[PDB]
Amino acid sequence: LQDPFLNALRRERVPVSIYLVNGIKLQGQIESFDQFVILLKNTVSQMVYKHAISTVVPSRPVSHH
Amino acid sequence: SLQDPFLNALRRERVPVSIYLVNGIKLQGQIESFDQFVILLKNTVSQMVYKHAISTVVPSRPVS
Amino acid sequence: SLQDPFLNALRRERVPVSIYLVNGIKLQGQIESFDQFVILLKNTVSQMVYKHAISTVVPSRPV
Amino acid sequence: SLQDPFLNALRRERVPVSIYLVNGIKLQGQIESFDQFVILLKNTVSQMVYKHAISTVVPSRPV
Amino acid sequence: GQSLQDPFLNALRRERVPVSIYLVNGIKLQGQIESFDQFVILLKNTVSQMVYKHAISTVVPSRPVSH
Amino acid sequence: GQSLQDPFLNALRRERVPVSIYLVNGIKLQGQIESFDQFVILLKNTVSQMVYKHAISTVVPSRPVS
């Protein structure tokens, strides 16, 4: 589920909200991702460790997961 | 496994659930789908929840 | 393997327990079943608790 | 080659200890037994503590 | 090469880009990435400190870094 | 060096440098690194306390260590 879900968000360049395990909310678009991290873009590309992520919430409906 | 049949029952019966995160935050919705690492929870949009950030999955009502 | 016999004892005897999560929050009920990754705790409904989010399992009385 | 000899000495000598959890909570008692994943701590009852939720084990005296 | 993580931290290290590393607690560390392995990142400032990746939420470059 | 963690901790233990170990909850521990293995670090002060690496966020030497 994970690969198809993130790939879709990446392909459609959908604005997303990534919430961390501390409650903090990051926003931007998914540039790329691998087994352990997600590169999130906004002013700069920041590397987010999936282990610190709780949820990835599309800013709008995204068909075909 | 106990996890799969529990989540599969909830998904199949479209039982509204509360998913508590390890930080105490509570998410609500219906389980759309899930794999070994995540659960897609539906409400306005489908959000992807990482199981490693989940503490407990509480059905809103008994599930056979 | 201490886990299995410890949880089995609690389940078998239907001893009320307190499961403290890693955020400090306490859950209570009886252990219905469990596997390598989760424990099904019962009270009003059966709720699925991920062991990775559990800090300690405390029985309400000696077992 | 450290964790086990450290835990065994504590259990063997029944040294009172404080186990700090990652949430800040401090548990106290004597280590009854342990395996690769949990530690059984005794006080009023035996509670099962998950090592993944433990931050530090502080003996109450030099061991 | 095989991950996004290696090339990304290598770029930062190589370019000696000042960075901010946010921990799961919320503390914000800063400095330059001296080195890193499978499990930790050495961050330099007054001293080299060792940060466990499992405690890291994000690594944010202070400026755009290409490639 | 395939591992960075091992030589870093070893230098600290060898030189007996006072360090600060910050835990994931924000709490800070201090003392000297007596020993360590794959999963824990033995920190000394009044007593030897066993710290699980998975609970550690950062190890900060109190001074430069060559």
mmCIF file of N, CA and C in Angstrom, chain E residues 25-65:
data_model
loop_
_atom_site.group_PDB
_atom_site.id
_atom_site.type_symbol
_atom_site.label_atom_id
_atom_site.label_comp_id
_atom_site.label_asym_id
_atom_site.label_seq_id
_atom_site.Cartn_x
_atom_site.Cartn_y
_atom_site.Cartn_z
ATOM 1 N N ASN E 25 11.903 14.564 20.060
ATOM 2 C CA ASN E 25 11.417 15.328 21.234
ATOM 3 C C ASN E 25 11.112 16.751 20.833
ATOM 4 N N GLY E 26 11.831 17.253 19.853
ATOM 5 C CA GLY E 26 11.564 18.609 19.462
ATOM 6 C C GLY E 26 12.821 19.447 19.524
ATOM 7 N N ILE E 27 13.866 18.932 20.156
ATOM 8 C CA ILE E 27 15.108 19.697 20.226
ATOM 9 C C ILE E 27 15.599 19.904 18.806
ATOM 10 N N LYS E 28 16.147 21.078 18.528
ATOM 11 C CA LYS E 28 16.677 21.371 17.206
ATOM 12 C C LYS E 28 18.198 21.457 17.268
ATOM 13 N N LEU E 29 18.891 20.474 16.692
ATOM 14 C CA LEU E 29 20.348 20.498 16.675
ATOM 15 C C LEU E 29 20.825 21.185 15.397
ATOM 16 N N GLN E 30 22.028 21.744 15.439
ATOM 17 C CA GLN E 30 22.576 22.430 14.284
ATOM 18 C C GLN E 30 24.077 22.229 14.205
ATOM 19 N N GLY E 31 24.604 22.363 13.003
ATOM 20 C CA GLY E 31 26.023 22.196 12.809
ATOM 21 C C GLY E 31 26.238 21.596 11.435
ATOM 22 N N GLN E 32 27.339 20.884 11.276
ATOM 23 C CA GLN E 32 27.648 20.275 10.006
ATOM 24 C C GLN E 32 27.794 18.795 10.202
ATOM 25 N N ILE E 33 27.416 18.058 9.174
ATOM 26 C CA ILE E 33 27.507 16.618 9.206
ATOM 27 C C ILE E 33 28.950 16.233 8.926
ATOM 28 N N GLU E 34 29.611 15.733 9.964
ATOM 29 C CA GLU E 34 30.997 15.287 9.919
ATOM 30 C C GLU E 34 31.101 13.899 9.272
ATOM 31 N N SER E 35 30.246 12.991 9.725
ATOM 32 C CA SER E 35 30.257 11.633 9.215
ATOM 33 C C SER E 35 28.935 10.981 9.591
ATOM 34 N N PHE E 36 28.739 9.745 9.148
ATOM 35 C CA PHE E 36 27.519 9.013 9.443
ATOM 36 C C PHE E 36 27.645 7.556 9.037
ATOM 37 N N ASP E 37 26.939 6.676 9.744
ATOM 38 C CA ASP E 37 26.959 5.273 9.383
ATOM 39 C C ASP E 37 25.531 4.788 9.334
ATOM 40 N N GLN E 38 25.351 3.481 9.412
ATOM 41 C CA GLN E 38 24.021 2.905 9.354
ATOM 42 C C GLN E 38 23.154 3.364 10.504
ATOM 43 N N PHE E 39 23.756 3.662 11.652
ATOM 44 C CA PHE E 39 22.924 3.992 12.822
ATOM 45 C C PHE E 39 23.051 5.383 13.438
ATOM 46 N N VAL E 40 24.127 6.107 13.159
ATOM 47 C CA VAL E 40 24.289 7.419 13.758
ATOM 48 C C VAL E 40 24.782 8.469 12.775
ATOM 49 N N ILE E 41 24.729 9.717 13.229
ATOM 50 C CA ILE E 41 25.231 10.863 12.490
ATOM 51 C C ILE E 41 26.131 11.663 13.448
ATOM 52 N N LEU E 42 27.339 12.006 12.996
ATOM 53 C CA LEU E 42 28.238 12.811 13.817
ATOM 54 C C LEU E 42 27.993 14.225 13.348
ATOM 55 N N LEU E 43 27.580 15.045 14.286
ATOM 56 C CA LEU E 43 27.293 16.451 14.048
ATOM 57 C C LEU E 43 28.374 17.276 14.744
ATOM 58 N N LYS E 44 28.953 18.226 14.016
ATOM 59 C CA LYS E 44 30.008 19.061 14.565
ATOM 60 C C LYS E 44 29.597 20.509 14.787
ATOM 61 N N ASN E 45 30.108 21.045 15.897
ATOM 62 C CA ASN E 45 29.935 22.403 16.342
ATOM 63 C C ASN E 45 31.071 22.603 17.338
ATOM 64 N N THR E 46 30.824 22.963 18.569
ATOM 65 C CA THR E 46 31.962 23.069 19.466
ATOM 66 C C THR E 46 32.671 21.695 19.508
ATOM 67 N N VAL E 47 31.895 20.619 19.761
ATOM 68 C CA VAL E 47 32.430 19.246 19.797
ATOM 69 C C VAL E 47 31.665 18.374 18.800
ATOM 70 N N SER E 48 32.168 17.174 18.555
ATOM 71 C CA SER E 48 31.461 16.250 17.696
ATOM 72 C C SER E 48 30.526 15.487 18.576
ATOM 73 N N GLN E 49 29.247 15.531 18.287
ATOM 74 C CA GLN E 49 28.360 14.751 19.069
ATOM 75 C C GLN E 49 27.782 13.687 18.144
ATOM 76 N N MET E 50 27.373 12.610 18.777
ATOM 77 C CA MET E 50 26.813 11.467 18.105
ATOM 78 C C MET E 50 25.297 11.401 18.285
ATOM 79 N N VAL E 51 24.587 11.537 17.172
ATOM 80 C CA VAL E 51 23.125 11.517 17.157
ATOM 81 C C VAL E 51 22.626 10.201 16.588
ATOM 82 N N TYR E 52 21.731 9.540 17.304
ATOM 83 C CA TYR E 52 21.177 8.274 16.832
ATOM 84 C C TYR E 52 20.060 8.559 15.822
ATOM 85 N N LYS E 53 20.165 7.977 14.634
ATOM 86 C CA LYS E 53 19.154 8.202 13.614
ATOM 87 C C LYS E 53 17.767 7.843 14.088
ATOM 88 N N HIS E 54 17.651 6.873 14.994
ATOM 89 C CA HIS E 54 16.322 6.469 15.467
ATOM 90 C C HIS E 54 15.659 7.588 16.261
ATOM 91 N N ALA E 55 16.461 8.535 16.737
ATOM 92 C CA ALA E 55 15.909 9.660 17.486
ATOM 93 C C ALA E 55 15.681 10.866 16.574
ATOM 94 N N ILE E 56 16.094 10.765 15.313
ATOM 95 C CA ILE E 56 15.950 11.907 14.403
ATOM 96 C C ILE E 56 14.612 11.924 13.666
ATOM 97 N N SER E 57 13.999 13.102 13.530
ATOM 98 C CA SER E 57 12.750 13.180 12.776
ATOM 99 C C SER E 57 13.097 13.708 11.393
ATOM 100 N N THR E 58 13.876 14.788 11.340
ATOM 101 C CA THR E 58 14.249 15.389 10.061
ATOM 102 C C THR E 58 15.640 16.024 10.006
ATOM 103 N N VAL E 59 16.178 16.096 8.798
ATOM 104 C CA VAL E 59 17.459 16.757 8.548
ATOM 105 C C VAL E 59 17.085 17.813 7.521
ATOM 106 N N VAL E 60 17.293 19.073 7.887
ATOM 107 C CA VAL E 60 16.925 20.211 7.046
ATOM 108 C C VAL E 60 18.132 21.059 6.665
ATOM 109 N N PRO E 61 18.515 21.056 5.377
ATOM 110 C CA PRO E 61 19.668 21.879 5.010
ATOM 111 C C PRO E 61 19.301 23.330 5.173
ATOM 112 N N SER E 62 20.301 24.141 5.506
ATOM 113 C CA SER E 62 20.107 25.567 5.700
ATOM 114 C C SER E 62 19.936 26.241 4.343
ATOM 115 N N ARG E 63 20.345 25.552 3.289
ATOM 116 C CA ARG E 63 20.230 26.102 1.946
ATOM 117 C C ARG E 63 20.089 24.973 0.931
ATOM 118 N N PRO E 64 19.587 25.298 -0.272
ATOM 119 C CA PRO E 64 19.411 24.299 -1.327
ATOM 120 C C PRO E 64 20.726 23.588 -1.642
ATOM 121 N N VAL E 65 20.622 22.267 -1.831
ATOM 122 C CA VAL E 65 21.781 21.451 -2.165
ATOM 123 C C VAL E 65 21.411 20.573 -3.333
#
